[PDB]
Each structure stands twice: as C-alpha cells, then as structure tokens.
Amino acid sequence: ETPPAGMQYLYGSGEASALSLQAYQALLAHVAAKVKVRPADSVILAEGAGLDDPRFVPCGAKPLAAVFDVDETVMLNIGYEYHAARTGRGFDTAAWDAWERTGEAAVAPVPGADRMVRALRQMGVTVVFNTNRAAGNAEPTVRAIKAAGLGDAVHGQTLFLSGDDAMGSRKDGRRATIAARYCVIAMGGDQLGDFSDLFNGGPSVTARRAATMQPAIAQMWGNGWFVLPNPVYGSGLKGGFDEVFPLDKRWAAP
Amino acid sequence: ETPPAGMQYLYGSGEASALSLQAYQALLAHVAAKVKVRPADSVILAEGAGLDDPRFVPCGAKPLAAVFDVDETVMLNIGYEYHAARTGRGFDTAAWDAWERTGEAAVAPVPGADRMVRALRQMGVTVVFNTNRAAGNAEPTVRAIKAAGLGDAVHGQTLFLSGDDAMGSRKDGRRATIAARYCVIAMGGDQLGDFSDLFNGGPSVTARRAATMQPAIAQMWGNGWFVLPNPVYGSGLKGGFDEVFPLDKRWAAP
Ligand SMILES: Nc1ncnc2[nH]cnc12
Numbered sequence: 001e002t003p004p005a006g007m008q009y010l011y012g013s014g015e016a017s018a019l020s021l022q023a024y025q026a027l028l029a030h031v032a033a034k035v036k037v038r039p040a041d042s043v044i045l046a047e048g049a050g051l052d053d054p055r056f057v058p059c060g061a062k063p064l065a066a067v068f069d070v071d072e073t074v075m076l077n078i079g080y081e082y083h084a085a086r087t088g089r090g091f092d093t094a095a096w097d098a099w100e101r102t103g104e105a106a107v108a109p110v111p112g113a114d115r116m117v118r119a120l121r122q123m124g125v126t127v128v129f130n131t132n133r134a135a136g137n138a139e140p141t142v143r144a145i146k147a148a149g150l151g152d153a154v155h156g157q158t159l160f161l162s163g164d165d166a167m168g169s170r171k172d173g174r175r176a177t178i179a180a181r182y183c184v185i186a187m188g189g190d191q192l193g194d195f196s197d198l199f200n201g202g203p204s205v206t207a208r209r210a211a212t213m214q215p216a217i218a219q220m221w222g223n224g225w226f227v228l229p230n231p232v233y234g235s236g237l238k239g240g241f242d243e244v245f246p247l248d249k250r251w252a253a254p
Numbered sequence: 255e256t257p258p259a260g261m262q263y264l265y266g267s268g269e270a271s272a273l274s275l276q277a278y279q280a281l282l283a284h285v286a287a288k289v290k291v292r293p294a295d296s297v298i299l300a301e302g303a304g305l306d307d308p309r310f311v312p313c314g315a316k317p318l319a320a321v322f323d324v325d326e327t328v329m330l331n332i333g334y335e336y337h338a339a340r341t342g343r344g345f346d347t348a349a350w351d352a353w354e355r356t357g358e359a360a361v362a363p364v365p366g367a368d369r370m371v372r373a374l375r376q377m378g379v380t381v382v383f384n385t386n387r388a389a390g391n392a393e394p395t396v397r398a399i400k401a402a403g404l405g406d407a408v409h410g411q412t413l414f415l416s417g418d419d420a421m422g423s424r425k426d427g428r429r430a431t432i433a434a435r436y437c438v439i440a441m442g443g444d445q446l447g448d449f450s451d452l453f454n455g456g457p458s459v460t461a462r463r464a465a466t467m468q469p470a471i472a473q474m475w476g477n478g479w480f481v482l483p484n485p486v487y488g489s490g491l492k493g494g495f496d497e498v499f500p501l502d503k504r505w506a507a508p
C-alpha cells in the first residue's frame with residue numbers, strides 16, 4: 001500500500017521541498033530589506049479592516065518580528081500523518097490531542113525552516129509562533145518546536161496558542177496582541193487562516209480563492225505574507241466538483 | 255462525490271492560489287534585479303555539470319529570457335484533470351494526446367501567470383516555453399497558451415516541445431538550445447525535471463528530496479529556479495511508506 005497522494009507530495013517529494021525552500025528564501029530576502037529600511041505598515045491587518053478594503057497595523061518603533069504558524073508551516077507533523085495514513089482517521093480530535101502531548105519525538109522541520117529561524121535571530125528579528133495547538137499543551141509544544149531545530153519558544157512572549165483568548169481557532173485576536181508589541185515584517189503559514197480570519201467562517205471555496213487575488217491582498221504573497229504547501233489537510237481540501245472545476249473549463253475524452 | 259484531495263487543493267483552494275502568486279512575485283522581483291544588473295551565470299546548468307558540483311552556462315551578452323514549463327506551471331489543465339477525477343484513469347496516454355489537440359477551450363492560467371507574462375515582456379524579457387507536450391501538437395498548444403492569456407508562443411523560437419530532439423521527456427537538450435541563444439535569468443516549473451534531468455532517471459524519492467537541499471541547488475529556489483505546486487500528478491507523487499515517513503519520526507495513537 002502507498003500513502004495518500006498529498007502525503008507522498010508534502011512529506012516525500014523533492015518538489016515540495018524546493019517549494020518550501022523557495023518560500024523561505026523569499027522571506028529571508030524580504031526581512032533583510034525591511035531590516036535596512038523599516039516600513040510604515042506591518043503585515044498584520046488592523047481590526048475592522050475587511051478583505052474589501054485592507055489596512056494594516058502601523059509599524060512604529062516596535063521591535064521587528066516575524067509570525068509563523070507551527071503545524072505544516074515551520075514544523076512537519078510526520079508522526080501524526082503517518083498514523084493518519086495507516087488508519088484513515090485523519091480527522092480525530094482525541095488522537096490529535098495526544099499528538100500535541102506526545103509528538104515531540106516524531107517532528108521534523110519544514111525544509112529550510114530551521115535555517116531561516118537562525119538567520120532571523122542573527123538578523124535581530126524576533127521569531128513569534130501563533131499556532132492553534134492548545135494552550136494546555138504549551139510545554140510539549142515548546143519541546144516539539146525545540147526538537148525541530150526551531151529555537152526556543154516561550155508561552156505568552158513568543159508562543160501564542162489556541163485558548164489564550166476566548167476565540168478558539170480564530171487567530172485575529174492573537175495577531176492583534178502580537179502587532180501591539182511587535183512590528184511584524186513577515187508572516188508565514190500554510191492555511192489562509194494564518195493571515196486573516198476573514199478568509200474563513202463563511203466564505204465558500206470559490207470565494208476564498210478569489211479573495212487571494214484581491215489586488216491589495218495579492219500584493220502580499222511573497223511580499224509580506226509567505227505561504228507553504230499543505231495538500232494533506234485543512235481548509236485547502238474542500239469543495240465539490242462545481243467549485244474545483246468551473247463549468248466553462250470542462251472536457252470529455254473521446 | 256468529491257474530487258481527489260490534491261485537485262481540491264491545486265484547482266479549488268485559495269491556499270494554492272496564494273502559493274502560486276507568491277512564486278511569481280518572487281520571480282518578477284528576481285528578474286527586475288537581473289535586468290538592472292546582468293549576472294555572469296544563467297540559471298541553466300552547463301552540460302556535464304552534475305548535482306554534486308553544479309555549474310551554469312554563462313550569461314554573456316545574450317538576450318535576457320525566462321524559461322517556463324507549461325502544464326501546471328503557467329497553465330492549468332482543468333479540463334483534463336476534470337476528466338481524470340470523473341474517470342479515475344489519470345494516467346492515460348491516449349486521452350492526454352487528445353487533450354493536447356482539443357483542450358484549448360478548457361485551460362486556465364495559474365494565478366498570476368498571465369500578469370507576470372505581460373510584466374516580463376514590458377520589461378524586455380523574452381518568455382520561452384519548454385514543455386513535454388508533443389511537437390506534433392504544437393499548433394493546438396500555441397492556441398491553448400494564447401487562450402490562457404499567456405501571450406504568443408512560436409515553435410522553435412519561444413516554444414520547445416517533446417520530440418524536437420531525440421531525447422523524449424528529457425529537457426536538458428532543449429535547455430541547452432535555449433541557453434545557447436538566450437541568457438535565462440529565471441526558470442519556473444512544477445516538477446524537478448523542469449530544472450534538470452539529473453533529478454530523474456534513477457534517483458529515488460528519498461534521494462531527489464535530499465538533492466534539493468544540496469547547498470548549491472538550495473540557493474536556487476526562489477532565487478533563479480521558481481517552483482509551483484502540483485500534488486495532482488507527476489514525479490512528486492511517488493514512494494511508499496518508508497520513503498514518505500522516515501522510521502525515526504513514526505508515532506502511534508493510544
Ligand atoms: N484533526 C486534525 N487537526 C490538526 N491537524 C490535522 N491534520 C489532519 N487531521 C488534523
């Protein structure tokens with residue numbers, strides 16, 4: 001038996017490896033330019049700014065930082081997805097809670113994520129993690145991040161988890177806390193919720209894809225917001241046939 | 255019924271859209287820097303240069319150009335993959351040959367690929383396509399490229415297809431022809447064979463992934479070689495369990 005195709009790609013292929021290394025290379029070059037010249041806008045949206053008319057929290061004189069999602073952005077959850085491939089039970093809240101507590105032995109860095117995290121700190125940029133892992137599992141998450149070669153994270157200062165506020169999986173509140181004390185010059189993630197909660201909680205698969213091509217949002221990709229692949233799970237694996245294949249681009253073999 | 259997960263991601267998700275827009279943004283910024291200052295090395299490997307010790311064809315005073323694979327790099331083959339999702343017969347040489355001849359009506363641009371192709375030509379950079387589509391289907395391929403908003407391609411000058419030499423799917427010979435008359439400052443692709451044939455024809459899934467992290471090769475991603483996602487088909491969807499999930503990163507739920 002062979003693993004699911006999405007796992008073959010993300011965890012096995014050199015295509016996905018080069019895809020990840022490219023994103024970090026662009027991130028390191030973008031941060032370096034912002035270290036030499038501090039911008040006026042940070043890369044975190046201001047509160048009340050919709051996807052229709054985007055506006056950002058100002059940078060000011062706050063310390064420079066970069067926000068990262070953890071799972072499948074800087075850290076590969078190889079151990080859990082191996083269990084998902086063996087079982088088929090990918091969506092399991094009880095199994096994932098155990099993985100958050102006992103998975104520090106089976107984690108790997110996204111290709112180049114350990115190298116960029118060191119470069120960001122040698123550049124004087126603080127590395128902040130904003131993950132939907134549970135606040136109750138903060139200590140095993142810190143150990144897993146350390147075991148992935150991603151440095152030392154501290155709960156409340158450089159690590160913000162689900163449950164730190166009364167908003168659940170919504171990360172806008174935690175992004176507001178980070179931007180209130182840091183000037184975030186770059187933000188990485190593998191799901192659109194890692195850049196704005198406005199991509200989720202309503203918009204359809206067709207609407208979310210169009211939202212990324214909003215010219216004010218489109219200018220962010222590779223230029224402030226940095227994306228990494230995840231065809232294994234999450235909000236990217238949704239939609240039926242009429243949403244994946246538009247009816248004006250359909251074809252039948254003879 | 256829902257389409258395969260990889261197709262949900264690549265063709266439906268906004269995550270894959272932002273992933274593609276990021277790659278082109280980095281490509282446009284890289285090309286602009288090379289227009290202001292022409293480099294000494296092009297991004298095409300010299301003949302006889304192995305992945306162990308990489309070396310590149312010099313740039314010289316040749317016209318600046320950028321090489322692109324077509325399928326799932328600049329053009330989405332929505333119509334064919336819709337047929338693959340309906341049928342399950344993804345690997346079909348007879349059906350794909352028909353798609354090369356009759357698919358110009360069901361193609362779309364990769365997000366931002368039509369915008370970058372115009373920007374490259376407004377910058378004075380020639381856009382060259384190196385695809386494994388058949389040379390016998392060059393004219394319907396030209397029409398499909400045009401229908402995707404990717405400009406005008408010419409067979410033999412800006413379009414090089416499988417069969418133009420006696421090497422089949424190997425693209426190194428066609429890359430040698432392009433680099434002999436152009437200074438290629440950027441090259442995009444969704445499979446590793448779009449950058450060097452040395453990634454294929456032998457190396458295992460584990461070996462190919464490690465090859466992308468060769469420091470001389472690793473410096474190219476997002477900095478000369480630009481990658482786009484394809485978890486739907488190709489050399490990225492290979493390998494068994496021992497190659498996707500290394501044995502030191504395995505885990506079992508309680
Ligand atoms: N339930 C889940 N939670 C988080 N990541 C996952 N990946 C696959 N299933 C998951």
Ligand SMILES: Nc1ncnc2[nH]cnc12
Pocket residue numbers: 325338344345346347350487488
């Ligand atoms: N046989 C094939 N040739 C090219 N692209 C494909 N995508 C899926 N199957 C394919």
Ligand SMILES: [Mg+2]
Pocket residue numbers: 069070071072073190191
């Ligand atoms: Mg994640």
Ligand SMILES: [Mg+2]
Pocket residue numbers: 323324325326327444445
């Ligand atoms: Mg291709």
